[PDB]
């Protein structure tokens, strides 16, 4: 279990993360990989502009390859055992008047771990409740709400993704009696955890940020932290992150002895994805032209797309020189190091737990 040695297919992921982060002053967490599942589901559903617009998401213009890729990354990622708990769940909530094609339900289920169910948008109050109950059910109450009755106004089809994670570190932190200290947001106190250890690390002059990898148990996942240098901000570091620059910055990381101080955090984040998607070039699927002939028996389209993600880091593992002191805002992400998947991406502006 070492860092990924391949080339990440993260051109879309990074574009999307940046667009979300630029428009929120708060903590954020989301799943770029899962957003790619949603777009591929809509692609599978559709009849071009759509194909040019999704070229960073679809695998080599071949549907069999696209299906096996997403299926493989999904099965690699997901797990519920002593080492970590990661569940991804996806649903289309479809108005009653729409006839859902059963074969679409089968490919959705099989390759994308997604489902479809009927609701009545004539009753946005009951429908909100239905969606929110689905969210609780599929995250074991970790997430509980994602929509209000108002956010369904005028809707015919709503696509919802939820994801949550908690794992054991390979190298746990000591549990310390209120290790409370200042956090300098863009001040407050936070609970920190601190250890010395051997961790992949670098100070990246190109990014203007330190990077730290902390692995999770299970030989698959790690959390990366990108901490801007004191003269720098998260937004300025983002402006210099693209697939090439990030690939190189991670490539330069070597195992070092590092003194690591991190704020504990636990929070969730949700957003309606229509707008950020359109901002990054994905527009056709939301236009008067869009259609879903392979999903709905024949003229309808996806009204709204929502994602809600939840995340927790704390000290815990199974048991038990550089300075990495994360006492100001930073970026984090979780990747599957066997395949390069960007499962979670987020930022901390205000530690909370």
Swiss-Prot record:
It is found in: Secreted. SUPFAM superfamilies: Serpins. Its main location: secreted. GO terms for biological process: defense response to protozoan; innate immune response; negative regulation of endopeptidase activity; negative regulation of melanization defense response; negative regulation of protein processing; negative regulation of proteolysis; regulation of immune response. Keywords: Glycoprotein, Immunity, Innate immunity, Protease inhibitor, Secreted, Serine protease inhibitor, Signal. Disruption phenotype: RNAi-mediated knockdown in female causes spontaneous melanization leading to the formation of melanotic pseudotumors and a shortening of lifespan; spontaneous melanization is reduced in double SRPN2/CLIPB9, SRPN2/CLIPB10 and SRPN2/CLIPB4 mutant backgrounds. During the mosquito midgut infection by the rodent malaria parasite P.berghei, severely reduces oocyst numbers due to an increase in ookinete lysis and melanization. Does not affect ookinete formation. Causes proteolytic cleavage of CLIPA28 and CLIPC9 in absence of E.coli infection. Glycans are attached at residues 259, 289. Belongs to the serpin family. This is Serine protease inhibitor 2.
């Amino acid at each position: 279990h070492g860092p990924f040695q391949g080339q990440r297919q993260n051109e879309f992921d990074l574009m999307f993360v940046k667009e979300i982060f630029k428009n929120h002053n708060s903590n954020v967490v989301l799943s770029p990989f899962s957003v790619k599942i949603l777009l591929t589901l809509i692609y599978e559903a559709s009849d071009s502009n759509t194909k040019r617009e999704l070229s960073s998401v679809i695998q080599n213009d071949n549907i069999d390859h696209t299906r096996s890729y997403y299926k493989q990354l999904l099965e690699s990622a997901q797990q519920d055992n002593k080492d970590y708990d990661l569940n991804i769940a996806t649903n289309f909530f479809v108005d009653d008047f729409i006839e859902v094609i059963n074969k679409y339900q089968q490919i959705a289920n099989t390759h994308y771990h997604a489902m479809l169910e009927k609701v009545s948008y004539s009753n946005p109050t009951q429908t909100a409740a239905t969606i929110n109950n689905w969210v609780s059910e599929h995250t074991n109450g970790r997430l509980r709400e994602i929509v209000t009755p108002d956010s369904l106004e005028g809707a015919v089809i709503t696509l919802v993704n939820v994801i949550y994670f908690k794992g054991l570190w390979t190298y746990p932190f000591p549990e310390v009696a209120n290790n409370v200290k200042p956090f300098y947001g863009t001040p407050t106190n936070a609970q920190y955890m601190e250890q010395n250890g051997q961790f992949y690390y670098d100070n990246s002059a190109d990014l203007g940020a330190q990077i730290l990898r902390l692995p999770y148990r299970g030989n698959k996942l790690a959390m990366y932290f990108i901490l801007p240098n004191p003269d720098n901000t998260v937004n300025q570091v983002l402006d210099r992150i693209n697939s090439a620059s990030l690939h190189q910055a991670l490539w330069y990381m070597e195992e070092n002895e590092v003194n690591v101080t991190l704020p504990k955090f636990k929070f969730d984040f949700s957003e309606q994805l229509n707008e950020p998607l359109q901002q990054v070039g994905i527009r056709e699927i939301f236009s008067q032209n869009a259609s879903l002939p392979l999903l709905a028996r024949g003229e309808v389209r996806v009204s709204r797309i929502f994602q809600k993600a939840g995340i927790t880091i704390n000290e815990l593992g199974e048991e038990a020189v550089q300075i990495f002191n994360a006492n100001r805002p930073f970026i984090f992400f979780i990747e599957d190091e066997t395949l390069g998947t960007m499962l979670f991406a987020g930022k901390i502006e205000n530690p909370v737990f």
